[PDB]
Paper text:
Although human Fam20B can be purified to homogeneity, it failed to crystallize despite extensive trials. hmFam20 crystallized readily, but the initial crystals diffracted poorly. The hmFam20 structure was subsequently determined at 2.2 Å resolution. The overall structure of hmFam20 resembles that of Fam20C, and can be superimposed onto ceFam20 with a root-mean-square deviation of 1.5 Å over 342 aligned Cα atoms. The hmFam20 structure enabled us to consider how Fam20C may have emerged in higher animals. Inspection of the hmFam20 structure (Fam20B-like) and the ceFam20 structure (Fam20C-like) reveals three regions in Fam20C that lead to a change in substrate preference.
The Fam20 proteins are recently identified kinases that regulate essential cellular processes by phosphorylating proteins and proteoglycans. The human genome encodes three Fam20 paralogs: Fam20A, Fam20B, and Fam20C13. Remarkably, each has a distinct biochemical activity. Here, we use a combination of structural biology, biochemistry, and phylogenetics to elucidate the molecular functions and evolutionary relationships of the three Fam20 kinases.
Numbering used by the authors:
A (entry chain B), B (entry chain A): 65 to 415
The structure:
C-alpha cells in the first residue's frame, strides 16, 4: 500500500520546542482516532504519586504509551472545600486539551475519551501489579484500586459492569524529556500563607533570579496562569517544561484537577498576570479575538468537544463559567494597562 | 465512528490564493493515497488541446475529477529537436509536483502515478467519445488515441497488455477558477525570433502595461521561470493564475513538457530573471538553503519521489541535471547582483 503515515509518527514529528500540537485538524484527528481505537497490548500501574491511574501500551509498528485516567465522578459532581480537593477528573483533561488548542497555546498533549472493556482489553494483558488490585463493588461492577501512595481498597475506580470510561493522554516521546521546577506562585498546602499572598510586589522578587530574568519562562507561566484560571486548576504547584538548543516551553501537562466548581472563579490563580502585569503579545491578540468573536469561547469549545467519543464532556455551567472568566482575564489585563500603560504591559517576544 | 475527514475535503480546504498545497505531509499523503486507490466512475476525452489525455471521475462522497496523462516514452528517452518537442511526459508531472513542494512554491496541484487496468476500470465507464478511440497495436496491446487536435490512430498511447501506466492530476475545485494570459516571454513557434530574444531591455517594456506594473504577477513569472528552467519546461507560452479578493498567483499547472533531455540546459527559459533582475526575497532564501544543504536538491527530491507507486520517476541523469541547473540559477542571480546591486534585485514583497 502507498502513501502511509502511522499516527504515532504523526505525533512524534509534530512536536517542536514551542508547540506540542499543530493547527491541522487532519493531523490531530488522525492521532485521536488512533488513540481511540488502537489495541491495548500492555496495561500496568505504578507505586509513585497520589492519583489512581494506569498506563496502557497501544499497538502499532512501534508501541505508543498512554496514561489512562479513569472516570471517578458523575458529570455533575461539585468539588468544593480546598481549591485542590479530590481525584483527577478524566473529562477535565479532555476539555483542557481542546481548550489549549482553541486558545492557540498548543502546549497540551493529545487526550481522547474512551470506553475500556476491562475484561476483554485490560485483564488479558495486565501486569501483576495492576491485576492484583482488581475487585468487585457491592453491585458486582468490576473495579481496580491500584497501587500508589493514597491508593486503597476502599477507594477503587469502578466500571459500569465491565466498561470503564476514562481519558487517554499520549506520552511525550523520549526525544522530548520533561523537566520540573517549583512554581513561584505555588500554594503552601497548610494553614500558613505563601509569600505571594502577603507580598504584593512579589513579582519584583521573582524576576531577580534565573530563569525568570531573561528568556520566555515568566511569560509562559503567565500564559499558563490564564489557562489554569479559565479551567479552575489551582494546583500547578510544580510546572514542567521541554527544552532544547532553540529554547524552552512550559507545557500544559496533567490538567485534570480542574472543572471542579462552576460557581466560583479563583482569581488567585491569575496572580502571575495580576502581580507581574506582563503579557505576551501573541497571547493578548488571541484573547481579544476570542472576546470579539460572535461565538463565545464556550460555544466554540463545545463544538470541538462534540467529536470526543464520551461526549458530553462538561455540563453547561462549566461552559458558561469559561465565558465569565474570559471577561475577568480581560479586566485584569486592562488594570495592568491602567497602572503601567499598554506598551509596558504587552511584551512582543515573537512567541 | 469518529474523527473522519474525507480526502477530497482536505483538498478543497487546503487551497488559498497564495498556496495550492501545504507543508503538511500528512494532509498531502492523505490526498495522494486517495488518488492512488479511488474507484474510477467515469472516463472521457476532449477535442480541445494539443495533447492526448483522458479525464477520470474518482468516487467519493463528492466526485473528484483528475486529468490522466498516459506514459508515452521510456524513462531514458532523450528528446531532441525544439526545446518544446514531443508528447507530455507523465513522469515529469509527478517530478514537477514534488519539486514544487520541495522548493516551497506550493503552486502545483497534487499528482500521483498509477497503473490503470484499462479493461476493468476504464472501458466499462468510458464515454463514447473516448471508447471509440480504443484500438490494439501490432502486439495486441490495448491502446487509445483520443480526439485532440494532433490525436490520431497512428500515434496511440499503449498499455502493457491492458495495464497502462500514467499520472493523475487533480482538478482545482470550482471555487478556484483559472484565468489564462499569454506569457510575455513566450516563444514564436516558428523560426522568427521573439522580441525578448532581440531586445535586451525588454523587461523595461513589460513593466509599463498591466498586470506587470504592480502586485505579484511579475515576481510570480520570475519564480516560475526558475521552476521551469530546473525541469526543462520551455513550453509555458500561456500562463494560468487563480485570483480572489486577497490577490492572485500564477500556478504550476501542466508541467509535463519537461525532463525531455538531461544533458541540455535551455537558459532562455530563465529570461524573465536574467532580463528583469528582480527576485522575490522568500524565493532567494529558499534557493540559498537548497544549495547549502548537505544533501543536494536531487537527493532530497528523489526521497519524496520514492513514495510514488510508479517509482523510479526520473533517471539519475535528470536528477543530476536538477543540481547542475540550480547552480546555473545561482550564477544568473549573482550576475544580477553584480550589475544592479543585491538590494535592488531582492524584493521583499512578503510573499
Ligand atoms: C453485564 O452484566 C450482565 C449481567 O447483568 C451480563 O449478561 C453481560 O454480559 C455484562 N456485559 C459485559 C460487557 O460484561
Ligand atoms: C532548531 O532550529 C533549527 C532551525 O529551524 C533547526 O535546524 C534545528 O533542527 C532545531 N533543533 C533541533 C534539535 O531540531
Ligand atoms: C496478457 O497479455 C498477453 C499478451 O502479451 C496475453 O497472451 C495473455 O493471455 C494476457 N494474460 C492475462 C492474464 O491477462
Ligand atoms: C481572504 O479572502 C477570503 C476570501 O477570498 C476571505 O474569506 C478572508 O476573510 C480573507 N482573509 C482575511 C484575513 O480577511
Amino acid at each position: 500500500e502507498y502513501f502511509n503515515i502511522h499516527a504515532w509518527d504523526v505525533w512524534h514529528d509534530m512536536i517542536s520546542v514551542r508547540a506540542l500540537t499543530v493547527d491541522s485538524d487532519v493531523e490531530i484527528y488522525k492521532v485521536l482516532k488512533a488513540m481511540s481505537s488502537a489495541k491495548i497490548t500492555q496495561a500496568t500501574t505504578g507505586y509513585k504519586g497520589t492519583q489512581l491511574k494506569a498506563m496502557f501500551s497501544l499497538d502499532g509498528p512501534q508501541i505508543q504509551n498512554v496514561v489512562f485516567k479513569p472516570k471517578r465522578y458523575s458529570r455533575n459532581k461539585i468539588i468544593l472545600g480546598t481549591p485542590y480537593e479530590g481525584y483527577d477528573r478524566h473529562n477535565a483533561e479532555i476539555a483542557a486539551f481542546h481548550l489549549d488548542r482553541l486558545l492557540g497555546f498548543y502546549r497540551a498533549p493529545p487526550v481522547v475519551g474512551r470506553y475500556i472493556n476491562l475484561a476483554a482489553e485490560v485483564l488479558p494483558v495486565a501486569a501483576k501489579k495492576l491485576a492484583t488490585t482488581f475487585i468487585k463493588d457491592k453491585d458486582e461492577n468490576l473495579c481496580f484500586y491500584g497501587k500508589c501512595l493514597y491508593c486503597n481498597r476502599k477507594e477503587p475506580a469502578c466500571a459500569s459492569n465491565v466498561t470503564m470510561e476514562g481519558a487517554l493522554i499520549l506520552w511525550l516521546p523520549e526525544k522530548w524529556p520533561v523537566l520540573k521546577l517549583p512554581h513561584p506562585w505555588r500554594r503552601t498546602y497548610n494553614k500558613k500563607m505563601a509569600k505571594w499572598e502577603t507580598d504584593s510586589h512579589y513579582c519584583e522578587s521573582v524576576v531577580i533570579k534565573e530563569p525568570y530574568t531573561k528568556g520566555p519562562r515568566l511569560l509562559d507561566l503567565i500564559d499558563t496562569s490564564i489557562f489554569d484560571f479559565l479551567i479552575g486548576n489551582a494546583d500547578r504547584h510544580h510546572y514542567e517544561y521541554i527544552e532544547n538548543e532553540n529554547g524552552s516551553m512550559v507545557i500544559h501537562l496533567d490538567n485534570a484537577k480542574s472543572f471542579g466548581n462552576p460557581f466560583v472563579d479563583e482569581k488567585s490563580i491569575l496572580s502571575p498576570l495580576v502581580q507581574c502585569c506582563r503579557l505576551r503579545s501573541s497571547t493578548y491578540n488571541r484573547l481579544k479575538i476570542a472576546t470579539s468573536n460572535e461565538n463565545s469561547l464556550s460555544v466554540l469549545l463545545d463544538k470541538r468537544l462534540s467529536i470526543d467519543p464520551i461526549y458530553p464532556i462538561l455540563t453547561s455551567d462549566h461552559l458558561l463559567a469559561l465565558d465569565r472568566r474570559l471577561l475577568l482575564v480581560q479586566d485584569a489585563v486592562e488594570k495592568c494597562f491602567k497602572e503601567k500603560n499598554k506598551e509596558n504591559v504587552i511584551i512582543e517576544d515573537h512567541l
